[PDB]
Amino acid sequence: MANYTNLTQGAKEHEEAENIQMGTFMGVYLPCLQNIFGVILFLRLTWVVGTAGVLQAFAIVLICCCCTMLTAISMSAIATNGVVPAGGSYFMISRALGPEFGGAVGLCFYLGTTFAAAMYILGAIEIFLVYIVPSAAMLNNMRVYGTAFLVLMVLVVFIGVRYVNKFASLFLACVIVSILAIYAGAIKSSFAPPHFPVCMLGNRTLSSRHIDVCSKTKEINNMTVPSKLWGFFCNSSQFFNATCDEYFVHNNVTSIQGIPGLASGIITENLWSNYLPKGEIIEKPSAKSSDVLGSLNHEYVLVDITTSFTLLVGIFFPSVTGIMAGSNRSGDLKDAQKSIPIGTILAILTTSFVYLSNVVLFGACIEGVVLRDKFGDAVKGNLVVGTLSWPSPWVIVIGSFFSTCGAGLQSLTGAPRLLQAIAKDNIIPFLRVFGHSKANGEPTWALLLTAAIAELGILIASLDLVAPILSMFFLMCYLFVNLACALQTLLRTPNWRPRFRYYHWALSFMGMSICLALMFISSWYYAIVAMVIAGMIYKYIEYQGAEKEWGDGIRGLSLSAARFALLRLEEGPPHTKNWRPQLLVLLKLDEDLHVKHPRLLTFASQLKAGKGLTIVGSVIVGNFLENYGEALAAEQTIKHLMEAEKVKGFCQLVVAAKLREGISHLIQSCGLGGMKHNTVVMGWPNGWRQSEDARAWKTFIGTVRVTTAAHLALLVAKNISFFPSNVEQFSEGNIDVWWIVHDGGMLMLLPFLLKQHKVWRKCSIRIFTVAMKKDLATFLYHLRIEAEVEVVEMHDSDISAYTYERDLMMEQRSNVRRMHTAVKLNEVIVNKSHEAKLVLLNMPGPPRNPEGDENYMEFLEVLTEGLERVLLVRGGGSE
Amino acid sequence: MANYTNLTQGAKEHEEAENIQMGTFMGVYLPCLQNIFGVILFLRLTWVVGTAGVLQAFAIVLICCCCTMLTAISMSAIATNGVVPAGGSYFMISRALGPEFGGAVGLCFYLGTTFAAAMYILGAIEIFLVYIVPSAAMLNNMRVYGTAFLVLMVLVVFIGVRYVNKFASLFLACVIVSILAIYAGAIKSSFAPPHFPVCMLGNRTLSSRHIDVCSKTKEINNMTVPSKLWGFFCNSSQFFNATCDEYFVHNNVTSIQGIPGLASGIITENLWSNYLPKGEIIEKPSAKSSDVLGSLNHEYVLVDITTSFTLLVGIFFPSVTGIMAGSNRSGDLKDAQKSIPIGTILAILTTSFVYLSNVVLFGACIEGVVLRDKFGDAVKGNLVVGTLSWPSPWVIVIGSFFSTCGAGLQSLTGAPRLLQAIAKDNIIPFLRVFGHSKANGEPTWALLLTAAIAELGILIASLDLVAPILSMFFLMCYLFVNLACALQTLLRTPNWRPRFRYYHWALSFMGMSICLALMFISSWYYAIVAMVIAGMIYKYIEYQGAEKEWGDGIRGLSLSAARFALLRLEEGPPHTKNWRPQLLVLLKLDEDLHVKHPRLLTFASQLKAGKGLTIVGSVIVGNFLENYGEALAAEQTIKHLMEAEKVKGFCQLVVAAKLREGISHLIQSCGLGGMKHNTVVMGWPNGWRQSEDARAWKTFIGTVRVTTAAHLALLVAKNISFFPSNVEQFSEGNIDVWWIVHDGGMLMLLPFLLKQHKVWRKCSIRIFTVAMKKDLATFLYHLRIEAEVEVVEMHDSDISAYTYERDLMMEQRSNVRRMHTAVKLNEVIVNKSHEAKLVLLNMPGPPRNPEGDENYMEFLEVLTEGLERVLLVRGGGSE
Numbered sequence A, B: 001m002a003n004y005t006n007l008t009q010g011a012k013e014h015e016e017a018e019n020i021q022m023g024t025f026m027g028v029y030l031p032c033l034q035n036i037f038g039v040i041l042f043l044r045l046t047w048v049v050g051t052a053g054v055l056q057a058f059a060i061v062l063i064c065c066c067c068t069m070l071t072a073i074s075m076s077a078i079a080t081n082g083v084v085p086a087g088g089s090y091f092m093i094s095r096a097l098g099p100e101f102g103g104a105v106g107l108c109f110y111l112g113t114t115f116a117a118a119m120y121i122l123g124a125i126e127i128f129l130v131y132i133v134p135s136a137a138m139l140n141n142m143r144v145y146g147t148a149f150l151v152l153m154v155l156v157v158f159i160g161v162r163y164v165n166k167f168a169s170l171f172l173a174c175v176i177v178s179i180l181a182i183y184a185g186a187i188k189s190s191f192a193p194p195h196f197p198v199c200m201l202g203n204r205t206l207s208s209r210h211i212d213v214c215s216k217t218k219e220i221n222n223m224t225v226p227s228k229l230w231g232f233f234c235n236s237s238q239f240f241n242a243t244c245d246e247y248f249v250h251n252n253v254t255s256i257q258g259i260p261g262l263a264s265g266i267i268t269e270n271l272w273s274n275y276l277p278k279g280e281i282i283e284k285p286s287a288k289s290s291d292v293l294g295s296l297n298h299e300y301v302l303v304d305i306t307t308s309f310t311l312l313v314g315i316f317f318p319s320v321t322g323i324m325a326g327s328n329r330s331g332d333l334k335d336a337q338k339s340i341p342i343g344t345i346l347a348i349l350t351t352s353f354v355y356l357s358n359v360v361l362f363g364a365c366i367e368g369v370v371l372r373d374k375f376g377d378a379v380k381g382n383l384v385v386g387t388l389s390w391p392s393p394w395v396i397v398i399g400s401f402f403s404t405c406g407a408g409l410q411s412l413t414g415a416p417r418l419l420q421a422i423a424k425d426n427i428i429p430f431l432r433v434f435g436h437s438k439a440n441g442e443p444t445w446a447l448l449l450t451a452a453i454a455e456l457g458i459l460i461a462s463l464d465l466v467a468p469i470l471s472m473f474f475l476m477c478y479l480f481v482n483l484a485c486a487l488q489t490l491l492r493t494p495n496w497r498p499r500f501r502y503y504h505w506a507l508s509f510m511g512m513s514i515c516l517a518l519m520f521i522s523s524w525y526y527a528i529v530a531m532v533i534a535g536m537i538y539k540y541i542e543y544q545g546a547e548k549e550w551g552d553g554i555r556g557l558s559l560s561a562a563r564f565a566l567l568r569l570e571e572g573p574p575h576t577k578n579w580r581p582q583l584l585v586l587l588k589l590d591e592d593l594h595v596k597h598p599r600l601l602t603f604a605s606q607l608k609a610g611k612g613l614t615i616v617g618s619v620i621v622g623n624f625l626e627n628y629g630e631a632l633a634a635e636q637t638i639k640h641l642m643e644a645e646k647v648k649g650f651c652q653l654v655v656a657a658k659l660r661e662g663i664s665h666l667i668q669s670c671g672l673g674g675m676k677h678n679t680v681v682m683g684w685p686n687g688w689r690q691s692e693d694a695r696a697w698k699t700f701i702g703t704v705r706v707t708t709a710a711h712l713a714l715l716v717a718k719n720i721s722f723f724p725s726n727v728e729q730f731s732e733g734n735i736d737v738w739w740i741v742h743d744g745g746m747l748m749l750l751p752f753l754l755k756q757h758k759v760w761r762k763c764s765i766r767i768f769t770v771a772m773k774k775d776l777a778t779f780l781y782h783l784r785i786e787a788e789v790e791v792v793e794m795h796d797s798d799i800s801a802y803t804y805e806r807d808l809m810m811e812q813r814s815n816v817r818r819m820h821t822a823v824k825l826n827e828v829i830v831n832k833s834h835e836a837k838l839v840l841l842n843m844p845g846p847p848r849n850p851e852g853d854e855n856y857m858e859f860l861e862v863l864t865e866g867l868e869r870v871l872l873v874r875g876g877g878s879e
């Protein structure tokens, strides 16, 4: 009806979409299914069931399926977020997780795929050599035949990939026919199981590759001659005073049925682990046996490797790898964000059900001795799982070989395409050589490097030793795919909208943890190497990206970090659960371009205590075209002064035509979006009455208006010349906070930030509240904070100029009286706090009409008449 | 003469220096020396040497000492950097590595010190019980007496820590006397060795706690009665028809000299590992032997644990820990940055020499069988190392017990002080309860928690199992102390000035690697757990510091990341090796407060490709006091427009009275210090002639002058209404770049960036150079990027307005002619590039006199007359 393929889509298929069909079954399901059903299912799954016991085999398959399923969930989250590129799964992963994670996952998955191309060649060779056409001799035969087969497959994928695309369907057909034959055999093995008997010597199993009858003597022409097995346990071969070894004279050779019925109940026997070390004779704990020993013979089927749990998990994991292949044919899709998750998860569920069912079927149909037999021995040299089939084990032994060579072709096509895709991106520079492609867009150098790595793999001519490396590389790939999603969900990474119905970051984190444990349990010494290689690739990609975009390596690296943090900072809830003063210190520069108030910087350092954001802003009156030299000079001066006063922050100078306009620009333009200030710290205009320039107090009140309108807090320090330094300290003193009717939050939060510094550390705090929603919060804060409270109530007229403005707020959401009341405020404040070390004090807002600015400044001046060091505070915002 | 201490200094002594002697030997040498020399040296060093063979024992001691030595170099780099706080080593590490690393190292070293207070109690109990006053019985005796001893020691520390301070000198005396006795025994043993004999039956070793004579018979009154050992090997006790066991009737008891002379040369025997598993009889491969076996008696000294190299390194590592104690008396110093490094390194060299010497001496003095005896048996139940001593083994048996009790006191005093120091810093919230102090400044609840954890340790009553956990915690502490220095040196962390003569970050990195390998080799089980615990505490401290300073958890976390990156960015070389345009798009806001040119944003997106820094600035004409609502509305509008055009960057609005002054403030003040821009992107003032308000071209040229003065690049896009959108593309075209005389960097770099975007991907590049060293640079760039070059020379007067400017540069380090030559430039440019999709084109500088501004604009308008899309470019800077 229709032709399809299961291979990948590299840069060749991506450049088509950059220059400018199938559903879920044929688009995402069949590709993932044909790539998960590897060779292990046919060559090591029975052996794993045997040497692990159905219970532990089920646990191993479940853990592997658990990591791969959680990784499928994370990969579906990656697939749904944003547009799905036309390329393979690598392009999706890159565009979703950034170039760093994209390249790390790409290289780990590529090493995985190369060693998979090696394992599948080794498996096809093992099937061809051992089962179809017959110690270290076997390893060298596998080496030479696997090298020949790899040189053949490389030429095939190099010359004629189109035929591989055409025959992918035949390979899938072979896989499915083989699995259905396995199931049909398991079923037919209920009533009529097959006739595969095994010669077993007591409870020690014998081979059958050369024996014919499981009897100590055969009878040709009524002559009780000794069977051929006599020649393998007795160096007499005649029975004429035969000198047989220990174990043979005592015990019995028996024809044990090798495949009992599915309902026979043999499962009760092999429900437990064996884990016998190397060279141990395989023992069935069912038949009778003597106790004599010593007869170490050649026909005893021996455990071929020192099996263990952590070894079995690694040997089995490369049968669940391949889930990223689900979305390696994503360019030819109709609804990608719908077709990819469903297809991938359904494929993984299908394969997990097949594996978990076959574990139990092998448990309950194959004898507990034929399962631990890792080379199909003891059954006259036929495939273990092959014995469970409807027609004959031949269907399985041919289907497995064709499937495994097809998967080898698949992995020698997907690995170099992925390598040219990682090369053309210029993510990693030195791989640029592999960016070269053929005329039709097929990799050439990538294919050669993949051939080299696959040959390196093949030189270890044993599935049991290649499987851990393959599994570790795919495990690292899945670990990064599971960790990047968790990170981008937690840290609110931009453009991370995982439009999935079931993806919760806990799932990806759980997958990361599960098969991180899998990596380490398999082999921690391989796993640390893999983690360090992946981390080095990740950091090198990050460094190259920084050098590419910003122009410098480490400079640009910190630049990228800052820019990314600021971006991530924008797309969030602009409010904060707590308010913290992030200061803009307004330093006034005299006509000599020196800081007219260093105590401003000293007090800012004492307020912020070396932490937080401090923007020191200053305006230089003049024309910028002919002042930039003076600008750089004064900026260096202010930076040196900031360093001298232990202020950590940034300096901004604006060369402006008018001081008021310069400061009005500074108050609203300082800081990059996200790193905005929230308070403006000003010095009081000392001698405003004595400076006949009418613009001093005007400029001050203008700055106050601009701050209030911008909804920033304001901290006007007065008599700042008498503020302390950083080296000196106070023996004993009282920070008196005079919280007038409104704006309590700042007035109480500041003296604690101050007393938390070494200078003001040894002083006490006294809250002289004068004028009840806010009242409750003060008690809670003072409980948080264990300072001292005090209430001093007075007449309403004295605080009229305050309450008036306060009233103006509630409806929103004279001068002679102001002066006659400010003196009352003076009376109380001095009579209580005259000898304080720092008096915080709430402020009234500036008048609406700019005419009473002289009156407002006189109000302030008299309000502060007689106090040593005053911190006028104004809220302005929400807090 | 002078009284001193070896304990630590917690918040008690730090608050004193915050409120406001000994040199190197008595200040930082002896405290470290008394604290490195622990119990292992006397109770397990001999067994380790025996079990490992002198070679592998030397390897163990060397690897451990190298880990701790590189950690000492990193710790000295920490000590020299900045003023050294008066508190313990914890305060130094905190003030040098930030509260995150400070708390992580503090807690890991604290758990280390607690399990050390447990191990030393176990050791004192083992010495008291096994040697001084005599299976699971031993373990339960150790549990009971260790719990009793911990209950006593907790009271001792709680009541009378001053006496621990007073008798630290006696403890050090005991340590050094024990070591000197070891050396005196070793030297004396050459000519005169002591008479410690060992019974040995063939090559199987016998015990000696109950047996008296190494003979199968003794003769009282000349009667051949069989020795007591006959009863322990024969159930007859009379020799009358003795039914003696197998290995006893055959072989020969021999009284082998247990301590042969240092000149005897036994080292040839015990130069090789034994690693015999649990329960194996200890064999000397020198004496004669029969071959029968089976008679597993109770008097055969056995291997008490399945020992391995990875186990021996863990068992021995808690003998090199203690270098952080070197600076536990850092408040009482004269020259801290000079005393601490030299003191610590000299103490570590002393202890390393002591260990590497005792290894070889035990190799050459103790029999190769008495070494593998882990409980001092076979020598009449005497301490194996004690046998090497001049006066008697009892000097060691007493000195070691007193030293181990003293080290228990030291580690039960250093752990609660450290815990209260971590608590009072408010680094971790929940530990606040442990900040509770006694009257004189001593911990109360921290002591209880330390006692609880030490008891949890003592429940494991075996040094061989407490040592790996102690070693893992101290190894994690050293790994963090090594990694933090390497990081802060690489990344150029602010205030990281390691004024040390020999510290290089490669040393700290090799130390981190060595000690990480040690962790994982010892037990990856505990290594992963410790790494995860320390990482969680680190991230949690970072989160708490964020929520403390910025006010929010994740918001504040990203804020802190950005602030730290920006700060790190300041203390560096402000120039970068490569020039990359970081755009400031000057968007023009109409009277409707709507962007008059979205194409500016589209083109900035195409130019930067969504990566890099893009600050979109705009001025609102008016007063800020009464426009803030309109300001926020237009800012939201511009943000929506930027997000619509895929522009990743920030937005800044300034409400100013004069558009020209607003722009002159934007250009020089945008961005936080470090994240400055270096290119200003403008839209051409279309219809400047048709506007009777001459302020259009005046403002444009003012902006150009400001950009030139600020030394920023300038990109004026003309006919921007024709610039393509994001969704469309160019099928084919040519970016014709006209590098006239100057600024080849930008003119060759911009079209490469543009062709790198999908819109301009399918177009080619043509350089129509018009006017030697600069031509060289062009060749290299074109070789790097593979674009097309071409040269079109013309007359000098035609480029007068350019070369004139050029002349002004050389000395640094008319209108009718310019116009009539501009039309010639027009003829060339149109004849070559009329149909070009985008003509880049160099700019002349604006006239020095502001009168020719109309003439300058007419010159530009002519120069650009007839072209579809022009990008006027001006370098301005260094590049």
Ligand SMILES: *[C@@H]1O[C@H](CO)[C@@H](O[C@@H]2O[C@H](CO)[C@@H](O[C@@H]3O[C@H](CO)[C@@H](O)[C@H](O)[C@@H]3O)[C@H](O)[C@H]2NC(C)=O)[C@H](O)[C@H]1NC(C)=O
Pocket (backbone or CB within 6 Å): A203, A204, A283, A284, A285, A289, A290, A291, A292, A293
């Ligand atoms: C297959 O047959 C062989 C030969 O009989 C089995 O080896 C023998 O198994 C018996 C089991 O009872 C072992 O006896 C054991 O001896 C130890 C030592 O005294 C005793 O503590 C136990 O209680 C038990 O009686 C016998 O030692 C062993 N022969 C050896 C090890 O040489 C083998 O176990 C059989 N396999 C299975 C799976 O049953």
Ligand SMILES: *[C@@H]1O[C@H](CO)[C@@H](O[C@@H]2O[C@H](CO)[C@@H](O[C@@H]3O[C@H](CO)[C@@H](O)[C@H](O)[C@@H]3O)[C@H](O)[C@H]2NC(C)=O)[C@H](O)[C@H]1NC(C)=O
Pocket (backbone or CB within 6 Å): B203, B204, B283, B284, B285, B286, B289, B290, B291, B292, B293
């Ligand atoms: C202490 O004495 C015992 C008793 O003689 C030693 O056990 C025996 O050691 C000999 C060493 O020559 C072993 O001989 C070896 O036998 C194996 C297997 O037959 C053979 O392949 C070797 O080439 C060698 O001839 C003998 O098996 C062993 N007896 C056992 C294991 O039951 C023991 O080695 C002595 N210990 C030391 C440290 O010398």
Ligand SMILES: *[C@@H]1O[C@H](CO)[C@@H](O)[C@H](O)[C@H]1NC(C)=O
Pocket (backbone or CB within 6 Å): A250, A251, A252, A288, A289, A290
């Ligand atoms: C071997 O078989 C014979 C007869 O079938 C039986 O008598 C004998 O007990 C068997 N041997 C064992 C060890 O079961």
Ligand SMILES: *[C@@H]1O[C@H](CO)[C@@H](O)[C@H](O)[C@H]1NC(C)=O
Pocket (backbone or CB within 6 Å): B250, B251, B252, B288, B289, B290
């Ligand atoms: C035990 O000692 C006797 C007497 O010296 C000697 O003849 C015999 O060979 C020794 N046996 C062994 C096994 O060395």
